[PDB]
Every structure is written in structure tokens, then in C-alpha cells.
Design a binder for this molecule. Structure first.
Ligand SMILES: Cn1cc2c3c(c[nH]c3c1=O)CN(CC1CC1)c1ccc(CS(C)(=O)=O)cc1-2
Length: 107
């Protein structure tokens, strides 16, 4: 699909140096053990991160751009659900979501 190729472009933008200052906590799965977030799995039923989405896209796990978009939004929603609203990581998620929503709207 043409729109799935657009999804590869979306990930390249989200992983780019321009956005690294706020995107970096979303690059890989939340490491509950190293971070001491032992209540994370009690709140978050479906963890998601950018590396997992990249692997799913490459393995043809998304039928269309809407399925890809749902996993990106799941990653943001997990952050908004788990953390207090004033947390530094929530502000970072919002800045990354701005990048994603503007690009996703172009297709
Ligand atoms: C998505 N996310 C991510 C983090 C996180 C934290 C609390 N709540 C979340 C959350 O919701 C603690 N901090 C926040 C960070 C300073 C701004 C870190 C630190 C390192 C990593 C990468 S890792 C591979 O070591 O997990 C992730 C996260």
C-alpha cells in the first residue's frame, strides 16, 4: 500500500534528530525493572513504543494507515493514562503527538 509507505516516512520523522529532545522516552519499550515502575502493567494493558511499531510495520502487521495510526495513538494514550498530567514525560508525549498528527493529516 502507498499509505503504508507514508507510515515509514512518519516513523523516520518521529525518530529524527530534530525531535530527539522529546521523542527519546518513546524509542523503546518502557523498561519497568530499570525505572522501578512496578505498577505499570497494572494500569497499561497494551504497552507500545516506536521500535515495536517500526518492527510491526516491517513485518506487515498493519493492514492500512489507520491500523498503524492506532498503535501510535495507543503509545501516547498509555503515557497520558499512566503518568500524572504535570509529569515532564506527558509534555514530551504532547510535543511528539504534534509532529505525528500534522504528518498523519497529510495522507
Ligand atoms: C513512555 N514513558 C517513558 C518513560 C517514563 C518514565 C515515567 N513514565 C514514563 C512513560 O510513560 C520515566 N522516564 C521519563 C523520562 C525522563 C523523561 C523514562 C526514562 C527512560 C525511558 C526509556 S527506557 C527504554 O529506559 O524505558 C523511558 C521513560
Amino acid at each position: 500500500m502507498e499509505q503504508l509507505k507514508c507510515c515509514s516516512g512518519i516513523l523516520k520523522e518521529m525518530f529524527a534528530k530534530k525531535h530527539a529532545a522529546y521523542a527519546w522516552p518513546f524509542y523503546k519499550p518502557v523498561d519497568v525493572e530499570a525505572l522501578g515502575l512496578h505498577d505499570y502493567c497494572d494500569i497499561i494493558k497494551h504497552p507500545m513504543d516506536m521500535s515495536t511499531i517500526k518492527s510491526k510495520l516491517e513485518a506487515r502487521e498493519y493492514r492500512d494507515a489507520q491500523e498503524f495510526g492506532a498503535d501510535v495513538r495507543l503509545m501516547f494514550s498509555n503515557c497520558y493514562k499512566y503518568n500524572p498530567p504535570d509529569h515532564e514525560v506527558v509534555a514530551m508525549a504532547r510535543k511528539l503527538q504534534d509532529v505525528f498528527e500534522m504528518r498523519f493529516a497529510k495522507m
